[PDB]
Amino acid sequence: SLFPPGLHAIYGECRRLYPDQPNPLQVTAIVKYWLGGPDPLDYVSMYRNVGSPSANIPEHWHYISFGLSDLYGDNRVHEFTGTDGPSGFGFELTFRLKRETGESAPPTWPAELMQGLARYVFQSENTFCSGDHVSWHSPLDNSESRIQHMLLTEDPQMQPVQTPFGVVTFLQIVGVCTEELHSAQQWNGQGILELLRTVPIAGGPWLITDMRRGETIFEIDPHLQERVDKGIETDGSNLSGVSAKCAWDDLELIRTRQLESVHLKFNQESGALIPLCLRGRLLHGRHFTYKSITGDMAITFVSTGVEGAFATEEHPYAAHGPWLQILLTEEFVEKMLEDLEDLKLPKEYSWPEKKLKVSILPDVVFD
Template identity: 45%
Template sequence: MFGNMREKEEFTRGMPAMHQNEVPSPRAFGLDALHNVCKEIYPDQCNPLTVTAIIKYWLGGPDPLDYISMYENPGCAELGVPPHWHYISLGLSDLHGDNRLHPKSGPGRPSGFGFELTFRLVREINETTPPTWPANVMQQLAKYVFNSGNMLLPGDHVSWHAPLGNGNGRITQILMGKDPQLPNLLTTPHGDVTFVQIIGATSEELQAAQHWNGLGVVNLLKTTRGCGPWLLTNTNRQHSIMEEDPTVAEKIQTGIEREGSNLSGVSAKCWWVQMSDNNNDEKYREKKNDESDDDDEDDDDNICEKDDIDRIEKNRTTDKINKNLSIEQQREHDNNNNNDSSFDDSFILKPLIGLHLTFNLEAGSLLPLAIKGRVMHGRHFTFKSILSHSAITMVAPSVTGTLVSCERPYVLQGPWLQVLIPDQLAEKMAYEFQLFNSTDQIQLPRTFSWPEYKLTITIVSD
């Protein structure tokens, strides 16, 4: 989903061998700067337990983080923070300054990607060594950053869809916050570094972040016993913050109604066909990555399914207008389609008479967010296809810089489809999409149709 939804890899399988207590070289100045700031917090832990992949990333290894240090944190009794393990990544920023992994930078500019990841895990009674599974979570998130070029920022969220840790608890999703003990900004010889903390969350908390905003939910987490002011992850936590305190749910609902959602897009399984005047699907359909011109473009059963795609859902705090999205789409076209003749007409505008959109259930469950949280607040929402390089953007009439208008509500430009949602249609959609309040009650496939707008949406199984 728009720079964010990657399906989690099974990090419990095929894991590279790890060396523990390997001491990183002290000659890397970026690494020295990170070690020094950690020593200020942990002066008696100069040689923390550290894990690293046997083969470094720049030598062809699979894991981009050079090291992950694990510290024993006593907590803070005055603030109600219990003892916990504190994990700090080393490698998203530039540790070496010699172009082996990141372009050279300097003070005032980001070092590498400009941040490192941290994680705080509640320490179990009689636990003497930190669990190593958080290091694998950090490596998976780092892979996403290296592969996509997208940053992770406080307020972002990650759709993980699996219990964190080794149990079957309710902490199955991830939110991103700011580490409470490390500096807001660390200046190193190779540039500036911030520290973004991973926070284990329930599915309900992730949904609240999607429908409202991530920073708002993170701030509410700070006030609860489950996470506390230092945003600890407790994999044994059994209740969401809404269940723990009913007033929290009221605050979230009020925020949604007043502010809408600042999630501007997601990666999704989605596609479309053009409908003619008689509502029959025409030959035209968006082309998949593995399709040729000779493929039967009317057969939706030929849609490729990718079962092992990493999914990262990122919630951006800055709202983007469609003109900016157009720039991003063009960058993607330049980077990904140099050898793809199917997108040679990327600058040609193709108005479509009617549309039949199809989403899988997970993407479809976000349609209420797209309409009520975005379009009805005068914004846009993008579904970035994980089946191809294409994207579907639903826009409100008040959004500027768009390709669509009342006269041509559906316009295709290269791989990018824009769909205008008039106010009356948005109200009808919001009413009908209440069905997604209980997704387990939806019989699939489920089709919504608005003939007067020549628009149909079908939801299929994941």
């Protein structure tokens, strides 16, 4: 087919929002993914959006991906299901980049950013949800920008589109500072997105990313730090897991292996989230899962009361294949927290009484 039905359906929504831009800049993957190319997004459209500057919606460039959803419906890349359910991964990515004075065209770098995010989705098959975060650890545009990480949210304008191949929603990338990423992790992504909406330079109502932003929302409004602190104290973290570098070693719907001792291994970044796991999750009666990006190992920490776990108070370390579940009691979680003040490799922590070891190791270990 010369015009792909999934593609045409999204274009209808684009036309609705941009009736005066029938011919926007669009980039494309020179060797398409379904022909062996490295980049999963077939196209990225790049629109001018005049916004509503008086309402703290600056003029900006609006990017929309094509490829995460099912464009073609002929099983060249995604599995066809029908009008019901998700089309491909069920969403496309968007991004809103503040226009800098002098710019006559959208910068093309956000297409490369989007390809990176999509490559991860296609390879890991971990999907993105509104409120999720993506740590990145470099200026998104390769400048010296403090904007070095991302939160994900519903696009504030693009409505879900019904296509012959399923429903497609639109998930907007929002650039954030390290401090803001951390706040979303320790509290909740939705809460931080809402704060960004209230600070024009940090996003405003449409969560436009300003790559020239030099200050965090907490530096702009110190009172916001108190709001977040109170939130972490009262609500804990809503983070149920991360895709990360991790492993474990041997030191109900299934029979599981009962482990006498366990050795948990993390890289620097995942290791730094251990206190969140313990204090922000387990002490709130919740669970937290580290899921390997490289392979199939996963470590799910559970607290007493968590339902549907195969780790129990009597047998607290239990595995089904590469999936480890570890039940920690409140008393022991509190002890671990004290011992992990520092949260330089390797770092080793050992609790012989509980037959538990934690190592923080270089990334290569997890290859």
